[PDB]
Structures are given as structure tokens and as C-alpha cells.
């Protein structure tokens, strides 16, 4: 059971119209039984809709989806998109982090994280959740720190300890320095294992940065993890691309993990 999180730069109608670019996205998506796609800039769900058309044009139920309304504090907006294989996992319940009120989501999160109760009969973990974040770069320290409150909430609502937390956290280089790791309860706490290391390069550009992350809490979900299966997916090499091509797919690599 492979799980992945993938920031797809300005993913929208323009990207999906382009067929080269669409074959590759599909080639990457088909790798996974659960993939979170971020930076969905699709005002009427036409890009989303186009992709599912490709994934389900043969067997109708290859994938099912979870999607958010567009989120952002101000006018620039994007959505979280979850595709999963229904035949290996199902969704028990989903919700959006509301910080404990109607309009509190944006009191600490520019893009209010989406939470998903997946049911997996193939792995050691039977039920577990995934929390999705694409932080505000200028506020990564606080936002990531705030994922800790989100974990407490997931325990409170679902009485679940087994939680994968992931997304483009902007968790490196300019945006989170070494000294700042101590300001993030998610990292200093013993409850969480950080599966993608700090020395990892999750960017398709010539920067070396550990921005995209995968974090796990709870014995059953921790035990399920295949050691050395957490890692970035370098599609440029994988597919033998030129930089320009890789670049025009996204400026991030998916982060993946395998569960048993």
C-alpha cells in the first residue's frame, strides 16, 4: 500500500489540456493507492474532473476522490485533492480543521487542513487518518507547529492515535532553519516519527530542500511502515526527462511511503 503527497505547481485546466503533461501526471498518480495532490488551482473542478476521466475511462472505479472547496485566507485560493483506490481502501469519514468554530480555520492555517479516516484491510493498521497541509511559506514555523493542535483534535474527534500527516510543509532552507525546529511541537515531541529526513531533496528545481514531508504517530501505523520506503520520488530520472519537462510537470517531487 503506497501513499504519496504531491504538490503540482498551478495544477489546473491549462496543465490538463496539455496531453504530454497530462500523461505524466497520470503516470505518477497511478503509482499510488492514496495520493494527496496540492496546489489545485481549479475554480470549477474542470482539471480535477479531467484527471478522473483518465483514471476511470476503463474501469469506472479505479479511483474515487475527496476534494475541498477553495481555501486561502485572502483571494488566492487552492484545494486539497485526495485520490484513492476504493478496492484497497475506503473512506469512513472526512472533515476540515475548524480550530473550534465557524470562521476559525484561518486563525492559524492559511489553507485549513483536510482530515480523512481511511480504512485499510491489507495493512497492519486497520483504520488510520491523513492530515493534509500546504503551508504558507512565510509562516511555516507556526503552521507546522499548529499541526500538533490538529493531531490533538483528531484524537478528540475520532479517538484515533494512528495518524499520517503530510504535504508541502515548506520545511527547509530559508523557511525553517535548524534553530526553529525547537519551536515546532510536531518535531520535538516523541509521539511523531518524521519519515522524510532533513537531508532529502523534494524539489524538482536546483535547490536542495526538504520541503515536502511525511509524519506518523501511533504504534500500529508506525509499525506498518516499510523501513526505507519513505522517500521523494524523482520523476525526472524515473522517466528520463529533461529538466524543462520535469519542471513543467511541477517544481516538487511527490513524497511517498509504503505500508505493509
Amino acid at each position: 500500500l503506497k501513499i504519496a503527497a504531491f504538490n503540482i505547481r498551478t495544477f489546473g485546466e491549462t496543465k490538463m489540456s496539455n496531453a504530454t503533461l497530462a500523461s505524466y501526471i497520470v503516470r505518477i498518480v497511478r503509482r499510488y493507492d492514496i495520493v494527496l495532490i496540492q496546489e489545485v488551482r481549479d475554480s470549477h473542478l474542470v482539471a480535477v474532473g479531467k484527471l478522473l476521466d483518465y483514471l476511470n475511462q476503463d474501469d469506472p472505479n479505479t479511483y474515487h476522490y475527496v476534494v475541498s472547496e477553495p481555501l486561502g485566507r485572502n483571494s488566492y485560493k487552492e484545494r486539497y485533492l485526495f485520490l484513492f483506490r476504493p478496492n484497497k481502501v475506503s473512506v469512513l469519514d472526512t472533515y476540515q480543521y475548524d480550530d473550534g468554530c465557524e470562521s476559525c480555520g484561518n486563525d492559524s492555517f492559511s489553507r485549513e487542513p483536510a482530515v480523512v479516516k481511511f480504512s485499510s484491510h491489507s495493512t497492519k493498521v486497520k483504520e488510520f487518518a491523513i492530515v493534509a497541509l500546504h503551508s504558507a511559506p512565510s509562516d511555516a514555523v507556526a503552521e507546522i507547529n499548529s499541526l500538533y493542535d490538529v493531531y490533538l483534535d483528531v484524537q478528540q474527534k475520532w479517538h484515533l492515535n494512528d495518524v499520517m500527516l503530510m504535504g508541502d510543509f515548506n520545511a527547509d532552507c530559508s523557511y525553517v532553519t535548524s534553530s526553529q525546529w525547537s519551536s515546532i511541537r510536531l518535531r520535538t515531541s516523541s509521539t511523531f516519527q518524521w519519515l522524510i529526513p532533513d537531508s532529502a531533496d523534494t524539489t524538482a528545481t536546483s535547490t536542495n530542500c526538504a520541503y515536502d514531508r511525511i509524519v506518523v504517530a501511533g504504534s500500529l501505523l508506525q509499525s506498518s511502515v516499510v523501513p526505507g520506503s519513505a522517500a521523494p520520488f524523482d520523476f525526472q530520472a524515473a522517466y528520463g526527462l529533461s529538466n524543462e519537462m520535469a519542471l513543467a510537470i511541477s517544481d516538487h517531487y511527490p513524497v511517498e511511503v509504503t505500508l505493509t
Partner: peptide
């Protein structure tokens, strides 16, 4: 395609203004 919006259960159909806003 089969799926849900967040916080929400399966929808059979969208009428009027959510129809256009979720067209795709």
C-alpha cells in the same frame, strides 16, 4: 465520478448554483 467533498457525504445531484460552481 464517485466521491465526496470534505465534511460532506455522497451527493446524488447538484441543483442550480452548486451545479455551475462544481461543473467540472
Amino acid at each position: 465520478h464517485q466521491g465526496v467533498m470534505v465534511g460532506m457525504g455522497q451527493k446524488d445531484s447538484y441543483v442550480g448554483d452548486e451545479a455551475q460552481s462544481k461543473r467540472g
